[PDB]
Amino acid sequence: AETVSFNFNSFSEGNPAINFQGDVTVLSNGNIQLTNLNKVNSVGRVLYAMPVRIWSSATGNVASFLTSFSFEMKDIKDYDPADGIIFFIAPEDTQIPAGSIGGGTLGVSDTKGAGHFVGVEFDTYSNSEYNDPPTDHVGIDVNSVDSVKTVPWNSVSGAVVKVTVIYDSSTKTLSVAVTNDNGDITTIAQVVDLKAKLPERVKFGFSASGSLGGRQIHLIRSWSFTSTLITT
Amino acid sequence: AETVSFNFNSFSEGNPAINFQGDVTVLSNGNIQLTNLNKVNSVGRVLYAMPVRIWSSATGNVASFLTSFSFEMKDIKDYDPADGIIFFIAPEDTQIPAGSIGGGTLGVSDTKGAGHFVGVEFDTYSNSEYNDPPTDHVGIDVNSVDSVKTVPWNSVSGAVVKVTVIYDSSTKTLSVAVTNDNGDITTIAQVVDLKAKLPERVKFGFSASGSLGGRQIHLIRSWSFTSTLITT
Amino acid sequence: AETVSFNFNSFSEGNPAINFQGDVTVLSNGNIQLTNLNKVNSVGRVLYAMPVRIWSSATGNVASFLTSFSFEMKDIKDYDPADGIIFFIAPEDTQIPAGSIGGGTLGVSDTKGAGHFVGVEFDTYSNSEYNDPPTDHVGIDVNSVDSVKTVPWNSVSGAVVKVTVIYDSSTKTLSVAVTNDNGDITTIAQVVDLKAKLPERVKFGFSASGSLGGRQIHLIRSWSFTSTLITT
Amino acid sequence: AETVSFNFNSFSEGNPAINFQGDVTVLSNGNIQLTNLNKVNSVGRVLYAMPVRIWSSATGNVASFLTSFSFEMKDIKDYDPADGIIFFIAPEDTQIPAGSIGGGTLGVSDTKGAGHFVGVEFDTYSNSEYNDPPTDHVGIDVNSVDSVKTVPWNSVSGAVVKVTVIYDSSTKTLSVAVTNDNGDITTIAQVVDLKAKLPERVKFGFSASGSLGGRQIHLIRSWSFTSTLITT
Numbered sequence: 043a044e045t046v047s048f049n050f051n052s053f054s055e056g057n058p059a060i061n062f063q064g065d066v067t068v069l070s071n072g073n074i075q076l077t078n079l080n081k082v083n084s085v086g087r088v089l090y091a092m093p094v095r096i097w098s099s100a101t102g103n104v105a106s107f108l109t110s111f112s113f114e115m116k117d118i119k120d121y122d123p124a125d126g127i128i129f130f131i132a133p134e135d136t137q138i139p140a141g142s143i144g145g146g147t148l149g150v151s152d153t154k155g156a157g158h159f160v161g162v163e164f165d166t167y168s169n170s171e172y173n174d175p176p177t178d179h180v181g182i183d184v185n186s187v188d189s190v191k192t193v194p195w196n197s198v199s200g201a202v203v204k205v206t207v208i209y210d211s212s213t214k215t216l217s218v219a220v221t222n223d224n225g226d227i228t229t230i231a232q233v234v235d236l237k238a239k240l241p242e243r244v245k246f247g248f249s250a251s252g253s254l255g256g257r258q259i260h261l262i263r264s265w266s267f268t269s270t271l272i273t274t
Numbered sequence: 275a276e277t278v279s280f281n282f283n284s285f286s287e288g289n290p291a292i293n294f295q296g297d298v299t300v301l302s303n304g305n306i307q308l309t310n311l312n313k314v315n316s317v318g319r320v321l322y323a324m325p326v327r328i329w330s331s332a333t334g335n336v337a338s339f340l341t342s343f344s345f346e347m348k349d350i351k352d353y354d355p356a357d358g359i360i361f362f363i364a365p366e367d368t369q370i371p372a373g374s375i376g377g378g379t380l381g382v383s384d385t386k387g388a389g390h391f392v393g394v395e396f397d398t399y400s401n402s403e404y405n406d407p408p409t410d411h412v413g414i415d416v417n418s419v420d421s422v423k424t425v426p427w428n429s430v431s432g433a434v435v436k437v438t439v440i441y442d443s444s445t446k447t448l449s450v451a452v453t454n455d456n457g458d459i460t461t462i463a464q465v466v467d468l469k470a471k472l473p474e475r476v477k478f479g480f481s482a483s484g485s486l487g488g489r490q491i492h493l494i495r496s497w498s499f500t501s502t503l504i505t506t
Numbered sequence: 507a508e509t510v511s512f513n514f515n516s517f518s519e520g521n522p523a524i525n526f527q528g529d530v531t532v533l534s535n536g537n538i539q540l541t542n543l544n545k546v547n548s549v550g551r552v553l554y555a556m557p558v559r560i561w562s563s564a565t566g567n568v569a570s571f572l573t574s575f576s577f578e579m580k581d582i583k584d585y586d587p588a589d590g591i592i593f594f595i596a597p598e599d600t601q602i603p604a605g606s607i608g609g610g611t612l613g614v615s616d617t618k619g620a621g622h623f624v625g626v627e628f629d630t631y632s633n634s635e636y637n638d639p640p641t642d643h644v645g646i647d648v649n650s651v652d653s654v655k656t657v658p659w660n661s662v663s664g665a666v667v668k669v670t671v672i673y674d675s676s677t678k679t680l681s682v683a684v685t686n687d688n689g690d691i692t693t694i695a696q697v698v699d700l701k702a703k704l705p706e707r708v709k710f711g712f713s714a715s716g717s718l719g720g721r722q723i724h725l726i727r728s729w730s731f732t733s734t735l736i737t738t
Numbered sequence: 739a740e741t742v743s744f745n746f747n748s749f750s751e752g753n754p755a756i757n758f759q760g761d762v763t764v765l766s767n768g769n770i771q772l773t774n775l776n777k778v779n780s781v782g783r784v785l786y787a788m789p790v791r792i793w794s795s796a797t798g799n800v801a802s803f804l805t806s807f808s809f810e811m812k813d814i815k816d817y818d819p820a821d822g823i824i825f826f827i828a829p830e831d832t833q834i835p836a837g838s839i840g841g842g843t844l845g846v847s848d849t850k851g852a853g854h855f856v857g858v859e860f861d862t863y864s865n866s867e868y869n870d871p872p873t874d875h876v877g878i879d880v881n882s883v884d885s886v887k888t889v890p891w892n893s894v895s896g897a898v899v900k901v902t903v904i905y906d907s908s909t910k911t912l913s914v915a916v917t918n919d920n921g922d923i924t925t926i927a928q929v930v931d932l933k934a935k936l937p938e939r940v941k942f943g944f945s946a947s948g949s950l951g952g953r954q955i956h957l958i959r960s961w962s963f964t965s966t967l968i969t970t
């Protein structure tokens with residue numbers, strides 16, 4: 043089988059194994075800070091530089107993957123804690139949408155909320171334009187920030203959140219387990235045909251954004267990942 | 275919310291949080307050995323002593339849970355490396371089946387391979403009487419060792435295996451991510467309505483067994499667990 | 507290490523992790539109400555259902571623990587706001603003393619004030635028969651409600667009180683930090699050898715009581731706890 | 739009573755409430771990074787700007803206090819993870835020792851390891867010149883980094899540690915509870931006469947240092963404090 047595996051307990055600007063897009067910046071503590079607190083409509087994204095083959099066009103097999111990462115979102119004086127973080131999968135040539143307004147687009151979609159990607163969003167602001175639930179939530183996104191499915195969640199400022207994601211190729215099931223600071227877990231699963239939605243080779247990464255009045259600290263602390271594609 | 279969470283990096287006899295059934299033994303390194311290498315049809319089971327309420331008859335809600343554990347199976351001279359380990363969920367009054375023949379029953383079912391439990395098996399011997407695939411495998415079991423679903427797997431002697439399981443109550447999806455020593459991951463997912471198959475109060479644990487000719491070292495090295503039930 | 511850890515931000519009847527004894531009742535808001543305002547000499551106790559091994563006779567080791575909890579006492583019309591709440595540790599077979607008169611015994615001692623337990627009381631009535639200080643007070647109790655040591659305190663009706671207790675096994679020191687509604691803190695420390703006073707396995711819990719004329723609302727709002735025993 | 743209370747969920751340079759000394763720096767995420775990874779023998783300290791009266795020469799009373807804080811230490815490529823962080827109490831005019839060599843001095847003692855301060859150290863390097871234990875450890879220091887008492891500990895890279903400290907004026911006991919990432923707790927308590935070792939007006943703060951070959955990330959994430967002095 044074809045396996046791609048990597049582990050990051052801290053990051054560094056200059057590490058070729060990672061693509062930095064937008065306002066992303068690396069702190070002296072190794073944390074990746076996605077958005078710039080001073081910029082309006084800030085958008086920052088980080089992608090694993092090596093594209094991953096999530097499915098074979100020859101066998102029709104989709105890859106199974108296991109990934110876990112930890113992030114932290116914190117409030118900053120006088121700004122609404124917005125808009126959130128999104129773990130996404132997109133075509134290998136993905137870039138921040140031209141003229142991105144940040145905000146509820148989470149840095150992965152156009153103004154209508156459309157884009158080419160599959161991801162798990164940790165949404166901390168309710169955008170009625172994208173049919174967001176009234177509270178903070180974790181959502182499964184398929185080519186749109188208008189979630190296919192969401193579950194109520196609570197974003198605690200300064201809290202380190204651990205997330206585990208399992209994608210089972212056979213069932214095409216995407217399940218997420220979120221471990222909040224207080225020990226409680228929040229889960230959400232959704233069948234998503236990766237081969238029908240994305241190209242053979244994709245890139246994995248994170249993205250976050252802010253608006254003029256909505257800004258907060260978005261940090262990726264660590265990230266381990268393993269994908270296995272059966273080639274037979 | 276109602277959360278039960280525990281983390282075992284090592285075990286020690288005398289700990290009231292752990293119930294031992296059968297040929298279980300605690301090694302000095304803190305590892306648990308499930309079967310006795312000198313006994314015919316050995317069965318060993320370890321359970322979290324406290325019953326967990328996976329669903330509420332009052333709200334009809336089912337709990338979501340996230341658990342990861344690591345184990346090791348090592349061949350011993352002369353015996354067939356069998357029969358494996360099973361991570362199961364059973365009624366709180368669960369006991370080793372009376373007159374258990376061990377072997378392919380994995381210590382959780384009767385001779386016909388039937389019993390009251392839901393589990394994830396790491397089967398290393400092909401029992402045709404229970405329709406086992408021809409190779410080592412991982413399987414989702416529901417009241418039977420005749421798996422509802424299996425996925426080809428490989429048990430490497432002396433290899434430390436890491437497993438992560440997510441049960442999403444909303445979708446009733448049980449997903450398993452197995453990480454082999456060589457970095458490759460194996461996944462298997464299955465929709466299982468815990469509320470329909472199990473009583474409100476259950477116990478979680480591991481069971482291993484052998485036969486006269488089938489014997490091998492079965493080790494549980496660690497186990498972390500978190501279940502969250504919505505009480506409103 | 508052998509660690510037992512739990513966290514309760516709210517409670518609900520049916521959670522097997524909790525044992526109720528006496529007139530305990532769970533409110534719709536998730537709070538636990540210890541006594542029944544309509545019963546004479548009411549006594550209500552809640553205990554963590556799983557026995558904890560605070561010390562090993564095999565190693566002579568004693569565990570250290572950190573626990574924090576919040577409670578509230580509210581006066582009711584024209585009953586005496588009596589008699590208080592007590593956080594205690596007792597043998598796992600602990601039951602409300604037979605023929606308990608409640609009142610000043612706080613639900614853990616006999617009529618003479620004797621019992622088998624260690625605890626921290628938040629006393630709101632002064633029982634001369636138990637040598638209570640003339641005012642409300644926090645006290646360290648060892649097998650008796652005739653506190654080994656007390657510190658003046660003031661129970662404010664309707665006020666939420668936060669408590670932090672640290673037990674350092676090495677020095678056998680039990681220190682308590684009580685944070686009042688107004689912001690001030692009250693502390694009390696006392697060396698207590700748990701190994702000498704209690705058996706290896708015990709239970710932690712809260713007890714409250716009243717009498718015929720002494721009754722009030724005793725509420726347990728939250729409770730987090732962690733103990734670690736060195737097994738080596 | 740005279741009570742001083744403050745709570746920081748994030749810090750920032752320019753906040754008059756805090757004094758910065760040495761190589762301290764405030765990351766955009768609100769975290770305080772005590773040492774400079776690029777400087778040899780780096781020392782950074784942070785203090786609550788306002789001196790706190792711990793004892794009174796008039797009444798002879800000593801204040802009790804409750805304080806908890808969280809920090810994080812993480813390794814950096816090719817540098818020994820040293821030397822650690824220390825929560826200290828010192829005269830209101832306390833300064834980084836003249837000609838400090840950082841390293842095992844933790845930025846509070848001279849070359850011989852002497853200084854005017856009381857503190858709890860989270861020591862990650864074994865300096866035999868100060869009689870350190872052979873492993874990472876937590877220690878109570880009184881005017882010397884030659885801890886009056888230490889307890890075995892383990893500094894996990896990238897893990898967020900929570901510390902709770904209670905000082906009971908009555909028994910003059912200083913007990914510390916350290917909650918590790920894996921949930922285990924470590925405690926240490928020592929009787930310390932603040933009145934005899936420190937002036938009436940003191941300053942609380944954190945200090946960390948490194949050497950040429952010894953460097954690591956030292957972050958202070960949050961800090962709440964409450965001291966109450968009985969003025970009668």
Ligand SMILES: OC[C@H]1O[C@@H](O[C@H]2[C@H](O)[C@@H](O)[C@@H](O)O[C@@H]2CO)[C@H](O)[C@@H](O)[C@H]1O
Nearest residue numbers: 122124125145146167252253254255256
């Ligand atoms: O409050 C945060 C949200 O802001 C929305 O945009 C605001 C913008 O921040 C404000 O300055 C003004 O222009 O009104 C806009 C419309 O609400 C974002 O659209 C939303 O995503 C949040 O970031």
Ligand SMILES: OC[C@H]1O[C@@H](O[C@H]2[C@H](O)[C@@H](O)[C@@H](O)O[C@@H]2CO)[C@H](O)[C@@H](O)[C@H]1O
Nearest residue numbers: 354356357377378399484485486487488
């Ligand atoms: O070889 C391992 C398998 O043994 C099977 O039982 C054998 C037994 O070991 C042998 O001594 C003889 O009695 O024949 C039995 C039937 O094949 C178990 O049934 C199977 O589960 C494996 O353990």
Ligand SMILES: OC[C@H]1O[C@@H](O[C@H]2[C@H](O)[C@@H](O)[C@@H](O)O[C@@H]2CO)[C@H](O)[C@@H](O)[C@H]1O
Nearest residue numbers: 586588589609610631716717718719720
């Ligand atoms: O007033 C509260 C105290 O009452 C004492 O008991 C009283 C009882 O309430 C009253 O009805 C009558 O029977 O006299 C008793 C003796 O004083 C309790 O002993 C004390 O603990 C408080 O609850």
Ligand SMILES: OC[C@H]1O[C@@H](O[C@H]2[C@H](O)[C@@H](O)[C@@H](O)O[C@@H]2CO)[C@H](O)[C@@H](O)[C@H]1O
Nearest residue numbers: 818820821841842863865949950951952
């Ligand atoms: O390795 C960390 C320890 O370093 C010790 O100092 C070293 C110094 O880092 C190195 O450059 C060379 O000069 O040898 C010194 C002697 O060991 C510190 O004394 C110790 O506290 C640690 O930081």
Ligand SMILES: [Ca+2]
Nearest residue numbers: 146165167169
């Ligand atoms: Ca949104």
Ligand SMILES: [Ca+2]
Nearest residue numbers: 378397399401
């Ligand atoms: Ca089998």
Ligand SMILES: [Ca+2]
Nearest residue numbers: 610631632633
């Ligand atoms: Ca009393």
Ligand SMILES: [Ca+2]
Nearest residue numbers: 842863865870
């Ligand atoms: Ca040192």
Ligand SMILES: [Mn+2]
Nearest residue numbers: 165174181189
């Ligand atoms: Mn959304």
Ligand SMILES: [Mn+2]
Nearest residue numbers: 397406413421
């Ligand atoms: Mn099988």
Ligand SMILES: [Mn+2]
Nearest residue numbers: 629638645653
């Ligand atoms: Mn009393």
Ligand SMILES: [Mn+2]
Nearest residue numbers: 861870877885
């Ligand atoms: Mn030291």
